[model samples]
Target: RGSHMAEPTAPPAFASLFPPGLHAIYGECRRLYPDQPNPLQVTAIVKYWLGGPDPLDYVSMYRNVGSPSANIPEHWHYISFGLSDLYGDNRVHEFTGTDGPSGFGFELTFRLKRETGESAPPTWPAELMQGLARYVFQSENTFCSGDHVSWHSPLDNSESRIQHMLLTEDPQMQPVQTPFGVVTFLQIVGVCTEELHSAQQWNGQGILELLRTVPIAGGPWLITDMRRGETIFEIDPHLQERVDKGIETDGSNLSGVSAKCAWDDLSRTRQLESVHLKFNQESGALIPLCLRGRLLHGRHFTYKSITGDMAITFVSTGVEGAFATEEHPYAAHGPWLQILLTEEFVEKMLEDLEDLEFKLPKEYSWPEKKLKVSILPDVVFDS
Candidate 1:
């Protein structure tokens, strides 16, 4: 009897690409255990994509958490792998496009390479191999995401610009193949239905906190909190100490504090005492002033030889004190009353004469004012 013609089995073209050792391992693994999952193969894929030789090796992909439109840019890179069942199956075959569009498709193109002996196929571009050795030494995740989103890659460096593109399921998506690998063009679809708007309230709060904590050193200073509707000239003791310590103050703070001096009759050259002076002209409300002045006779006197036209300005950060003046309207030939009537001495003696000068004028009603004083640098009492 004639034997039945044997049916032709499918050619094992893909399987033929594996090394003999690997083929035997695969065959024995399948034969010895039919129910157990292929642990080795599964682990290999995980290792290839995520783990590597270096501790920092890893990949990261992120989506804008609340983006509304699917207007993300397209980014592509070529990846090459040896012939293996893992590579054949784990490869991305389709991209689920983002929401809001229909008939969207993603495209990916791959170039085939067949190795013979130690030589690669002539069809394989030389550029592909030129950069291959460099990337090979890099962790596998480096090829995927450059180690991490924050990590830098050596291959791209400053010369190359890696581009990211939006992916879609549209059939019309165009794909390109490079010498190193294939490029897929597609837009992401099926995004969450919830709409999200950019939020800035938290960021604004952060900026506010930053401003409040910023240290201020002397000169002119202004502190403003828009949320509080308060503007102030903050003369902190710490700031003056910093200046006295020979630390230079930044220009911004100096300018701010200096602006407050506009109310005083003294020019920039005239310095007040250790106490601050306030011009209680605004809103008829009296702001306490701290006057800071140096004694004309003292070992601490900074101006020993200074005479005539010498002006000093002093800013103080302390409680406001009483203002005193002496009258020398008609004295003349003997001891000029004006000689002892300097603003600095008058201010200092105000405490002793508090019952006299600090008392509110009975004839004219004045609002109760409390002042804080701080001393500024380069203060002159005579000017």
Candidate 2:
């Protein structure tokens, strides 16, 4: 917003201390909330520069007055200040190139509904952003618009029902150009378990778009209300029917998930060497869903270990099912085990995933190898 004006002759005191990236973000916020009387911010005690665990240097919170005409509720907007290349030197983020975005190319934001009795914003949201920042800094997995994360527990570490998160571009914040590169604001919206399952079953973007229709649950900005109980499906039963049709036709849209999975060489039996693939129930369900989501659509899906030892790829083919150990046929992939899937097998696997029981310990035999897959029961937690 300040880009239109001529460069100022005089610089503010200590202005050089902050980089152009930081100033660019601040200028955009100023354009949106010029009248923000008092803002709350949490500064990291030991910054990343000092070997701190948290990657985010600062998290700022601003009070937003809802539009009465649109029936949107008042909410606190939390935005992180360090995910992108705040310091043009790239000391924090190692990405380089003018053709791409700066650092991860985006900062994280969250919106929590404001209550009438609350005088000040809660501090938990800031902690939540730091936790997310930790994941990004450590794993180097950046989030994108329409992406959904499954957090099985309460977001606030309380008895709240809101557990999962759905990411989208901030409704009011546009992409900003800084000296480092372009950065977009990604908003994390709270979602329920039902919504998470629906997102996995149908599509993340589709479910988010549907949720936008319900003002109390998901407004124009998609604010997260910690106290919400009913899910979007419960609010509209016909929507569930529509989603079921979507699954029947297009299958799932969830492409991939990070899961706890392992594969081992089983003791040699009569003829062929056997391999056993083990996965927890959560990972087991997700693996098939991701396969269906990708292979059916003529896309290849790969499951790789974080450390790069165990890597398996699935590809759709016209011939019968085949497992190959040869060099990867695609340019993007190196040497990795490949499972060629036929349409009939995909249809059968989709039907198997549909069962409520999901009886596992299924085995498939190939000429070269015998593959046995097992889905272990998920651990139960007592609260």
**Candidate 2 lDDT tens digits, 95-159:** 47545787889999988899889888899989888888888888889898888888887998978
- Residue 376, model 2: lDDT of 61
- List, residue by residue over 89-164, the lDDT tens digit for candidate 1: 3322122222221111112111111223523222222222223323434533212210111112212232222111
- Candidate 2: give the clashing pairs: none
Predicted structure 2: lDDT:
0.72
Root-mean-square deviation of each candidate, in angstroms? 26.6, 9.1
- lDDT of the candidates, in the order given: 0.22, 0.72
The candidate scoring highest on lDDT is 2
**Which 10-residue window in model 1 sums to the lowest lDDT?**
190-199
